[model samples]
Target: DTATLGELAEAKGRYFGSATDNPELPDTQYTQILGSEFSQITPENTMKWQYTEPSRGRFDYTAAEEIVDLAESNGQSVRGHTLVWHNQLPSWVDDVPAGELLGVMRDHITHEVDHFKGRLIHWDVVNEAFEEDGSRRQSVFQQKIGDSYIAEAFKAARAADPDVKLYYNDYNIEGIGPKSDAVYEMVKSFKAQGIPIDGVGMQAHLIAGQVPASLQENIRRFADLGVDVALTELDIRMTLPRTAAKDAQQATDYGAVVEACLVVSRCVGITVWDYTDKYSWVPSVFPGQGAALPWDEDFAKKPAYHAIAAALN
Candidate 1:
């Protein structure tokens, strides 16, 4: 019997799932939701900068280590959520002056990467470094040390573990848009200088109707440059109330997204950010929005789930 796309993916070690809610979830809930389709684990709430690094010259790894332990015990591949990102840095990281701050930054990267050594298979090494308009993001990392910090982080990660694959992850740049082009250019420069970059992660936060037509080619362009790509953090949004059209569009976009992945060998896999609408952070964060997951509020598979499964087969 021919396998369905989901079945094929499972046979090929396909792990279909989302970032689990760690602190509040029960053991049964964890075993039920995560133990099903998830062969990879991402920390949803605890791995951010403030939570992980509350004080300077001090380090904490309790929460992050918990996820790693679970993933390792469960036989799941793990992607270190991120190393250098704009959002999660503490105010103290930005308070230090440039020369001193750059040192702290390097130390921070070295410590984090070294702590997770021999565990993580993939790392979101650098994230959201540029705005969609090709302007540098006004992040503290950019303001203090500029983009050199990115190269520095990648170098340190390689020194920590040469075997781990490093990825540059971001949103709004899955297609050949201004941001996507900028990323490719940066990757090209990194390659020119013998940087240890290995892959690019297209964080696909899309609207239901707007899966970019050139998405596959855009991914291929990066692969042509000798870097692997993956559709990470994928989910499509629709209006508040789920209508037939919105549902259908979600289904179609799911197919399109997977189809795009299939045509490019350098494109690795797809991981949606959330599995069920019941616990979806999209609506809570965005307000007045719902139905952004492949599963219903009760964790029942939706039309889009079947669509993606079929496409992958």
Candidate 2:
């Protein structure tokens, strides 16, 4: 009488998902549960501009295709990680003239979007465009194309694939703060201006015991603007060498995140950065912080997993 995480989420009319990279797919143990436990998948690195089009005017979808094919076989929908992001961009992007950058951005969006036209449920059309203080981030897009670049990326994606939902994804916006306010105002303007933006994504990379109390409120406001909202790339990291208290708090955090989404009709779903601690991005990047996912390194479900299933149930 047991149900998988995917099944539990489906009962509530939402999806449970994870972002996985191509390099980790070779492990049979990981893939087995990944294909079964989740209803949605995202290409972690392969879908980024650097990997999808490593060279100027040259496109490669091999790694992306491999991930999509895996998702297809599992009967899972893929959320295109991003179309235009500030990080992980190819070096060629920086070398382009400011005037030509928009076109280059457009071309990349169109090509990548077209290639995966019918295979995606959502695309993070433009990512991490705002700073914590609600100011426009100083990326090449902003420095060159000005504030109009975010809209243009969404426009290009819509033209390329009319059906796929488009989202503006970022981190540290799980709670009501200046950064989230900036996104709220932007999506508000985009809605008013009739921009092609369909949704907003809160990356929700939280720390233990710091799950935003206002997470639901933020999602509510974003949804009120007539756009879907999602908790994308969710993971609660703690100081390395797990302890009981932090693990319990992480479970609570995960529950809060899922519950926040469930109460908001337009908050569509939740996607962990990856499902297991073994493949987590925390330890390598943030020393002394690890165990950021639902499953431990050995593929055993952690308290966070139980908390998520409970919340969804």
Candidate 3:
């Protein structure tokens, strides 16, 4: 038998992790590997706003608790996925008056963070707040509260749980460019101004043969600002039905990502969005795109899995 992913990553003082959801907990075949093989677990949807607090002032923890409980039982650390995000937000958030928006946002974060408390290792306090360019997206929080809403969100999270590392997570910023430049400036400013920001999460949702060549530099750049950096939501999606050539390329891409993180001291760890293709979010979101994980639907390890292990070695 070979060493598992978690053991390999642990040797380097980093975690190998994946995302999970409440609905998928029933699959014993999936849960077995998830509970044992991963050192950290991220909730894909249960911890998001829409599920935790469906209605105003009424919070339900059933779904989120399920995953958290599972993680605790398996001696794994939980990564609180997101406290504030534009997508999957409740309808009431949009109806709040501008003057009262910050209060509402802070209240939600306080409730979520306080509930989880010391159970988490890190929290993606804010997610996808920027667009393709270096500008802020027009989410309700941004439109009503302006760009300052990000600092407010992190402040609230820190207040609720000072121990958990706070992260600003976004996709397509794995490489150095205008968008990443904007994020770099934010982290730099936050560090200088005592905003309590602790990490920058480069969500590596890449396509096959498109893993950014500058990924290592970008990670080092963030760590240079005195903040931990991580590949938070990593997956390399391919165009279609898989071929041997495509699979080889996918394995190389995965190895490259793992290698990129290994070289940086503060590049804490890597977390795949989800572990297996059976539950991948790729096909549902990107039509004609599939097989974007290290494990196939049958729960067999793929070349990408071996590549990650080899890189970790």
Candidate 4:
């Protein structure tokens, strides 16, 4: 019998998780593998604004709740993704007047947080709030509510569920650079202001052979800020027509990410964007590039899977 990833991670006081989608549940092999190998799950999209509240004041947890129930049944903890983001937002959010936008944002966060309450151990209360240049993206929330929207979102979530760890998640911040530096400053400010932010999500979306050298130091800095750090979305894509060389490099990259987390005590754990390449969002979004997950399309474990296991052990 093989040691499951979850068990290996648990021995070290961490959880190994994978992001999942509700639609993928019908694939028996996919669901079985995901549930057995991982201890935590993050719904990839069902919890987004469009799915949760497609229309103004009309909330529907049908899809999101199904994923939540699935995780609970499997004895896995849920990491609620993305209470606020610029993408996948309902059209109604754009139409709201500036005078009322803050209320709407707060209400949305509060309702959603209260709905899940104790079920989620962590919540991405805000996502992608900054640009690569280290400046705030002029998302509707920021434009309407000012730069204070990030703090407001976390505050509302804390008020709704005081126990859940609130995080600010973003991509390409795995290394020590301007983007990550900005996030570091933001976390410091949040703490200084007595805000409720509890963690920083480093979405380590990488390409083959491009693992950041400063990953541990970056995570360590955030840990020093007194908040948890998580490798929220770990994936490595290569120009596909997947070669053996590419596969080996991808494995090495995955191993490096796990090692980075292991070295940082405050780094809670890692959650791959999704486990299998079959349901990966990479190809559709990036075209001609994918195979970024630990499992191949046929549900067979790939080199990255072995690399992750080796690192965990």
Question: All candidates' lDDT scores?
Answer: 0.78, 0.92, 0.93, 0.93
| Predicted candidate 4 versus true structure: per-residue lDDT over 1-313, tens digit per residue | 7889988998899999999998788999899988899999999999999999999998988999999999999999999998999999999999999999999999999899999999999999999999999999999999999989999999999999999999999999999998999999999999999989999999888888888899889999999999999988888998889999999999999999998899999999999999889988899988899999999999899999999999998
Q: Give model 2's TM-score versus the native structure.
A: 0.99
TM-score of each: 0.93, 0.99, 0.99, 0.99
lDDT string for model 2 (1-313, tens) is: 7998888998889898888998898899999999999999989989999998999989999989999999999999899988898899999899999999999999999999999988999999999999889999999999999999999999999999999999999999888999999998889998889898889999889999988889899899989989999988989999878988889999998998898899999988889999999999999999889999999999989898889989998
Task: After superposing candidate 2 on the true structure, give the runs of residues whose Cα lies further than 4 Å from its correct spot.
Answer: none
lDDT score of residue 223 within candidate 4 = 99
Question: How large is the C-alpha RMSD of every model relative to the true structure?
Answer: 2.1, 0.8, 0.8, 0.8
Provide the lowest-lDDT 10-residue window in model 3. 53-62
Question: Which 10 residues in a row give candidate 2 its minimum summed lDDT?
Answer: 238-247
In model 4, how many backbone clashes occur? 0
